[PDB]
Amino acid sequence: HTMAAQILKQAMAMGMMTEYYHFIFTTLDLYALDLEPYRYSGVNLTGFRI
């Protein structure tokens, strides 16, 4: 999740947040993070919880 946040930082930094994208992740502490400005990008994304 730490390195997930790192990926999200880098993919903003490369600008790889496009509405084309829909992506696949593993660890499930995903909701808890500092997350807010990302959802304003048109990208499709989905998570998992139990």
Contact 48, 22 (CB under 8 A): no
User: Rule CB under 8 A: is residue 40 a binding residue for a second copy?
Assistant: yes
Return the residue of 2, 3, 19, 31 that touches a second copy, per CB under 8 A.
19
**How far is Cα 28 from Cα 18, in angstroms, rounded to an integer?**
23
Q: Could you say whether residue 37 binds a second copy (CB under 8 A)?
A: yes
Question: In this complex, which beta carbon is closest to a second copy, that of residue 26 or of residue 40?
Answer: 40
Interacting residues with a second copy (CB under 8 A)? 12-15, 17-19, 37, 40-43
